[PDB]
Design a protein around this motif. Structure first.
Motif, PDB file in Angstrom:
ATOM      1  N   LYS A   1       3.765  -6.637   3.635  1.00 52.90           N
ATOM      2  CA  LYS A   1       4.673  -7.396   4.498  1.00 52.90           C
ATOM      3  C   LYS A   1       5.497  -8.377   3.676  1.00 52.90           C
ATOM      4  N   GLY A   2       6.811  -8.351   3.870  1.00 56.68           N
ATOM      5  CA  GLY A   2       7.688  -9.230   3.120  1.00 56.68           C
ATOM      6  C   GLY A   2       8.250  -8.557   1.875  1.00 56.68           C
ATOM      7  N   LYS A   3       9.397  -9.040   1.408  1.00 53.25           N
ATOM      8  CA  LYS A   3      10.033  -8.495   0.215  1.00 53.25           C
ATOM      9  C   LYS A   3       9.164  -8.734  -1.025  1.00 53.25           C
ATOM     10  N   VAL A   4       9.106  -7.746  -1.919  1.00 52.47           N
ATOM     11  CA  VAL A   4       8.353  -7.871  -3.166  1.00 52.47           C
ATOM     12  C   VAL A   4       9.257  -7.447  -4.326  1.00 52.47           C
ATOM     13  N   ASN A   5       8.864  -7.791  -5.550  1.00 51.78           N
ATOM     14  CA  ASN A   5       9.655  -7.467  -6.739  1.00 51.78           C
ATOM     15  C   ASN A   5       9.503  -6.020  -7.188  1.00 51.78           C
ATOM     16  N   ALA A   6       8.280  -5.508  -7.110  1.00 55.99           N
ATOM     17  CA  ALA A   6       8.007  -4.147  -7.541  1.00 55.99           C
ATOM     18  C   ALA A   6       6.727  -3.641  -6.918  1.00 55.99           C
ATOM     19  N   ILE A   7       6.567  -2.317  -6.899  1.00 59.84           N
ATOM     20  CA  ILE A   7       5.362  -1.690  -6.359  1.00 59.84           C
ATOM     21  C   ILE A   7       4.950  -0.508  -7.239  1.00 59.84           C
ATOM     22  N   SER A   8       3.645  -0.392  -7.483  1.00 59.92           N
ATOM     23  CA  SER A   8       3.066   0.693  -8.280  1.00 59.92           C
ATOM     24  C   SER A   8       1.854   1.283  -7.568  1.00 59.92           C
ATOM     25  N   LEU A   9       1.809   2.610  -7.492  1.00 57.29           N
ATOM     26  CA  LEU A   9       0.706   3.334  -6.875  1.00 57.29           C
ATOM     27  C   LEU A   9       0.226   4.244  -8.001  1.00 57.29           C
ATOM     28  N   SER A  10      -0.981   3.981  -8.489  1.00 60.72           N
ATOM     29  CA  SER A  10      -1.527   4.729  -9.614  1.00 60.72           C
ATOM     30  C   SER A  10      -2.938   5.261  -9.432  1.00 60.72           C
ATOM     31  N   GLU A  11      -3.116   6.548  -9.722  1.00 67.16           N
ATOM     32  CA  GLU A  11      -4.418   7.198  -9.621  1.00 67.16           C
ATOM     33  C   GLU A  11      -5.035   6.982  -8.249  1.00 67.16           C
ATOM     34  N   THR A  12      -4.434   7.617  -7.249  1.00 65.25           N
ATOM     35  CA  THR A  12      -4.889   7.505  -5.874  1.00 65.25           C
ATOM     36  C   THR A  12      -4.949   8.874  -5.218  1.00 65.25           C
ATOM     37  N   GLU A  13      -5.735   8.963  -4.147  1.00 66.37           N
ATOM     38  CA  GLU A  13      -5.910  10.194  -3.376  1.00 66.37           C
ATOM     39  C   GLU A  13      -5.746   9.843  -1.901  1.00 66.37           C
ATOM     40  N   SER A  14      -4.907  10.590  -1.194  1.00 67.28           N
ATOM     41  CA  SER A  14      -4.685  10.356   0.230  1.00 67.28           C
ATOM     42  C   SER A  14      -4.477   8.884   0.585  1.00 67.28           C
ATOM     43  N   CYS A  15      -3.625   8.205  -0.175  1.00 66.86           N
ATOM     44  CA  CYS A  15      -3.317   6.813   0.104  1.00 66.86           C
ATOM     45  C   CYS A  15      -1.883   6.735   0.621  1.00 66.86           C
ATOM     46  N   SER A  16      -1.637   5.799   1.523  1.00 61.73           N
ATOM     47  CA  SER A  16      -0.306   5.629   2.076  1.00 61.73           C
ATOM     48  C   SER A  16       0.128   4.185   1.922  1.00 61.73           C
ATOM     49  N   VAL A  17       1.417   3.986   1.682  1.00 65.43           N
ATOM     50  CA  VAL A  17       1.951   2.649   1.508  1.00 65.43           C
ATOM     51  C   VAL A  17       3.106   2.396   2.457  1.00 65.43           C
ATOM     52  N   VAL A  18       2.998   1.315   3.223  1.00 65.41           N
ATOM     53  CA  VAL A  18       4.039   0.914   4.152  1.00 65.41           C
ATOM     54  C   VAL A  18       4.605  -0.368   3.568  1.00 65.41           C
ATOM     55  N   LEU A  19       5.919  -0.413   3.372  1.00 64.36           N
ATOM     56  CA  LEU A  19       6.531  -1.600   2.801  1.00 64.36           C
ATOM     57  C   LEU A  19       7.832  -1.929   3.502  1.00 64.36           C
ATOM     58  N   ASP A  20       8.323  -3.139   3.251  1.00 60.53           N
ATOM     59  CA  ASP A  20       9.585  -3.585   3.811  1.00 60.53           C
ATOM     60  C   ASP A  20      10.654  -3.299   2.764  1.00 60.53           C
ATOM     61  N   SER A  21      10.673  -4.079   1.689  1.00 64.85           N
ATOM     62  CA  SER A  21      11.648  -3.845   0.636  1.00 64.85           C
ATOM     63  C   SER A  21      11.070  -4.192  -0.724  1.00 64.85           C
ATOM     64  N   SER A  22      11.651  -3.608  -1.759  1.00 61.97           N
ATOM     65  CA  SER A  22      11.220  -3.864  -3.119  1.00 61.97           C
ATOM     66  C   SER A  22      12.478  -4.014  -3.945  1.00 61.97           C
ATOM     67  N   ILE A  23      12.577  -5.132  -4.653  1.00 64.12           N
ATOM     68  CA  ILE A  23      13.741  -5.420  -5.474  1.00 64.12           C
ATOM     69  C   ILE A  23      14.002  -4.399  -6.581  1.00 64.12           C
ATOM     70  N   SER A  24      12.978  -4.071  -7.363  1.00 63.21           N
ATOM     71  CA  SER A  24      13.160  -3.131  -8.467  1.00 63.21           C
ATOM     72  C   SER A  24      12.753  -1.706  -8.140  1.00 63.21           C
TER      73      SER A  24
END
Lengths: 157, 157
Positions: free
Chosen positions: B47-70
């Motif tokens: 929730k809320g704007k973030v600078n960056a997001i990384s999803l590493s070495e995951t299985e059946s994971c989901s990511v819900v986001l608003d916005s990411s600067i980079s």
């Protein structure tokens, strides 16, 4: 599994060869197919036209061939080498890391298909004095919606 | 390693979560970055704007986001899901098998870069009645010398 080099019907199987100081020569016929698997540090030399060629699960293996009617496929092979004296319609490369292909003038138009592969280079005899010129194969694609349409493209820096 | 969910300076670390029935919510700030690793069957909600997001070495994971600067990068993640409510400039996907991305109208022009990835689909809200339309991401490239030049292209059947 011990070294295997046998013709079963019209199919040659070359498997389980390790660090071979000498070239593994196969005098083949145009109706035969070649399968090279589970080999390391080996150079397979195919003399004569063949129907197809497969290089599977190999490390630092090189293949020298004249021509292949249907082409050649490379899967799970790292640091592989391919040299075509005459020609083949295509070479497929999948899940392979490191590869160097040298094409002859006759085989200049060979189609190369790649999938999850890295450090792949293709050399064409189009330099000066018949000299080779290297072409590193791009690995990423860019996809986005633009100008009313979603399009994919090879990424180029 | 036990479940980890901590903010170290301006970096959030979400790791070692398994089969989470409830959404893992992160109330983040625009100067913070998100790192999600070694998680299975988890839905991370940023929730809320973030600078960056990384999803590493995951299985059946989901990511819900608003916005990411980079933007966001996905590596070694299988059966992943991404939903953007606002927007980000790009999403990189590498060595990942299975992925479903849903973009909002604001994020319609997001650039998607892929490398050694499979079964990746991108959904744009450009159908009728705001409905989503799926775009399967191509995985092969074709390379050949033609018309005096060696060229690469996305393979399309």
């Amino acid at each position: 599994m011990p070294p295997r080099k046998e013709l079963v019907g019209n199919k040659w199987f070359i498997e389980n060869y390790e660090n071979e100081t000498e070239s593994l020569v196969i005098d083949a016929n145009k109706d035969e197919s070649i399968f090279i698997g589970k080999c390391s540090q080996v150079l397979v030399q195919i003399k004569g036209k063949v129907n197809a060629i497969s290089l599977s699960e190999t490390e630092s293996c090189s293949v020298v061939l004249d021509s292949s009617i249907s082409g050649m496929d490379v899967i799970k092979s790292n640091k592989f080498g391919i040299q075509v004296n005459h020609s083949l319609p295509q070479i497929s490369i999948d899940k392979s890391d490191g590869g160097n292909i040298y094409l002859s003038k006759e085989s200049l138009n060979t189609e190369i298909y790649t999938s999850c592969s890295t450090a792949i280079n293709v050399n064409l005899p189009i330099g000066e004095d018949d000299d080779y010129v290297e072409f590193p194969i791009p690995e990423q694609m860019k996809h986005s919606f633009a100008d009313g349409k979603f399009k994919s493209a090879v990424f180029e820096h």
